[PDB]
Amino acid sequence: LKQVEIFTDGSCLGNPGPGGYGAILRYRGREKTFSAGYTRTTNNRMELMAFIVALEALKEHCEVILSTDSQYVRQGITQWIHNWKKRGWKTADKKPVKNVDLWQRLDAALGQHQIKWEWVKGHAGHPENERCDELARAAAMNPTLEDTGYQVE
């Protein structure tokens, strides 16, 4: 209970296609579950959205633990975002970084909290993570939202 715990997953079979996300936020003495389906999206965008939604539900500065098997998110945090920000959210070719809208939205949310990242592997021994996966898959079957920022190529 001391720290907020957030668990996430994103799922999307097409590039782009219908996708969804699941997130579990353990906050106070409670568990809150978030999940939604998008008509035309990508896996990676779904993985960022899952963090974005759970973090933005926090109304004050918290200590947060983010346990995640997402490689995309892991590389973004540990390798990409430091440089990206120095470069004005451009790649070496001076084009806008892919999914810049969601990365910036996510960075602004992380910027509110004491974040502890735990990078983890398969589903075994991560029941929350496995439930988020189930949520994300279910939402993708029944997409009802528009992924407004998605761009081709």
Swiss-Prot record:
Description of the deletion phenotype: In a strain that encodes a retron, the msDNA is abnormally sized.
Names of the cofactor(s): Mg(2+)
Outcome, altering residue 9 to N: Loss of activity
Residue ranges annotated for the RNase H type-1 domain, each copy included: 1-141
PANTHER family listed in its UniProt record: RIBONUCLEASE H1
Residue numbers binding Mg(2+) 1: 9, 47, 69
GO BP terms, alphabetized: DNA replication, removal of RNA primer
Reaction catalysed by this enzyme: Endonucleolytic cleavage to 5'-phosphomonoester
Chain's role: Endonuclease that specifically degrades the RNA of RNA-DNA hybrids. RNase H participates in DNA replication; it helps to specify the origin of genomic replication by suppressing initiation at origins other than the oriC locus; along with the 5'-3' exonuclease of pol1, it removes RNA primers from the Okazaki fragments of lagging strand synthesis; and it defines the origin of replication for ColE1-type plasmids by specific cleavage of an RNA preprimer. Involved in production of retron derived msDNA (a branched RNA linked by a 2',5'-phosphodiester bond to a single-stranded DNA).
Principal cellular location given in the protein's record: cytoplasm
GO molecular function: endonuclease activity; magnesium ion binding; nucleic acid binding; RNA-DNA hybrid ribonuclease activity
Keyword terms: Cytoplasm, Endonuclease, Hydrolase, Magnesium, Metal-binding, Nuclease
Subunit note: Monomer.
One Pfam family linked to the record: RNase_H
Outcome when changing residue 69 to N: Loss of activity
Family the entry assigns: Belongs to the RNase H family.
NCBIfam families registered for this protein in UniProt: PRK00203.1 (NF001236)
Gene expressing this chain: rnhA
Name recorded for this polypeptide: Ribonuclease HI
EC number: 3.1.26.4
Subcellular location as annotated: Cytoplasm
GO cellular component: cytoplasm
Organism expressing this protein natively: Escherichia coli (strain K12)
Residues the entry annotates as binding Mg(2+) 2: 9, 133
